[PDB]
Amino acid sequence: LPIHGVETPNDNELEERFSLCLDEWGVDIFEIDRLSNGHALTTVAYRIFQKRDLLKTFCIDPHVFVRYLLRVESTYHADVPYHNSMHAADVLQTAHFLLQAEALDDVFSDLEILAVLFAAAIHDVDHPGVTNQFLINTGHELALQYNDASVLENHHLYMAFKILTEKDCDIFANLGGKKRQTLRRMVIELVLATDMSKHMSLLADLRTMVETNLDNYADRIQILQNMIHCADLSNPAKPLRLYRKWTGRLIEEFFRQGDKERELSLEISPMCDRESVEVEKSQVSFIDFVCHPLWETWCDLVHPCAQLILDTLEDNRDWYECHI
């Protein structure tokens, strides 16, 4: 069993970086992926899970863990610039980080921590590099199949759970039936919370909660839904170099989508037009209307355990306002 779960060409350099970076906000996942040779998701997940004793706690065989994580990782599409396994690993680590706020100390069961971190790692698996709305305007097969509701998010979940079915990949094989049913329902609810069409409702829920303690599932689970959705939308609150990197990729993906939407004669989807999308304006607008309202609330929830996040978010917002 190697130190990082799967063998890499740079075990000592990755170990140094993991020991300094895994509990920090602002991890260079791109470099982890280069040093691990395509294995940021696999190595990040493995070491998060050991650090939180989750393999021991849930009797997960560490070989079975690595084998499953390698399958999921190779199910993300390398040739998709943003929605690949690097994005998954970033989301995973940012979720791991979010959980450590003092204000949330001693609150979540282990099973709930297991759920949210598993969700993060799988939440974009097999993404094809187009949006839900594009699936729906082309009448793509998955859009028809899911009746327009959460088309990708549903697909991500389906793929993740079909992989658990493969010979010697069943990482939850040693939970009881009751813990496996409650785990499955939690994972479903969590990855579904990554669907943008839920953003308004989850955030009204979080605002309501802050405007008041939590030992009802109902509240905890609403906090974990907001949390994974925060991690997913963390990029603009990351150090600027990392924000810009993630952004260049997202836009390259969107623009590529705009070309199939242009080279099939349709109403080019939003921010997807190479010709006349204002990239710096487009980010300022995403912050003001989407990302800032979310992070402000989250940060209000965990007062003051996440002040840095809200500070960098505000700086990158101003930086872009200037470079338009």
Ligand X SMILES: Nc1ncnc2c1ncn2[C@@H]1O[C@H](COP(=O)(O)O)[C@@H](O)[C@H]1O
Ligand Y SMILES: Nc1ncnc2c1ncn2[C@@H]1O[C@@H]2COP(=O)(O)O[C@H]2[C@H]1O
What residues have CB less than 8 Å from 35, skipping those under 6 apart? 8, 9, 10, 13, 14, 17
Residue 253 makes contact with Zn ion by CB under 5 A: no
Residue 144 makes contact with its own copies by CB under 8 A: yes
**Contacted entry of ligand X, ligand Y, Zn ion, none for residue 231, CB cut-off 5 to 8 Å set by kind:** none
* Residue 317 neighbours by CB distance under 10 Å: 18
**Contacted entry of Zn ion, ligand Y, Mg ion, none for residue 233, CB cut-off 5 to 8 Å set by kind:** ligand Y
Nearest to Zn ion of 44, 60 (CB atom): 44
Distances (CA, A) of 195 to 76, 132, 149, 170, 233: 18, 9, 9, 26, 11
Question: What is the Cα–Cα distance from 295 to 234, expressed in whole angstroms?
Answer: 9
Site residues for ligand X per CB under 6 A: 83, 124, 194, 196, 232-233, 235-236, 247, 250, 283, 286
Question: What is the Cα–Cα distance from 43 to 46, expressed in whole angstroms?
Answer: 5
Residue 124 makes contact with Mg ion by CB under 5 A: yes
Residue 162 makes contact with its own copies by CB under 8 A: yes
Binding mask 132-171 for ligand Y (x = CB under 6 A): ----------------------------------------
The answer to whether the bond into 304 is cis (omega within 30° of 0) is yes
Contact criterion met (CB below 8 Å) for 65 and 1: no
Binding mask 81-100 for ligand Y (x = CB under 6 A): --x-----------------
Among 173, 196, 209, 210, binds ligand Y (CB under 6 A): 196
Choose, from 39, 83, 87, 123, the residue flagged as catalytic.
83
- ∠ CA 255-273-154 to the nearest 5 degrees? 55
**Contacted entry of Mg ion, its own copies, ligand Y, none for residue 286, CB cut-off 5 to 8 Å set by kind:** ligand Y
Mapping DSSP to helix (H, G, I), strand (E, B) and coil, where does residue 36 land?
coil
Question: What is the Cα–Cα distance from 274 to 191, expressed in whole angstroms?
Answer: 30
Binding site for Zn ion (CB under 5 A): 124, 232
Q: Which residues are catalytic?
A: 83
The footprint of Mg ion (CB under 5 A) covers 124, 194
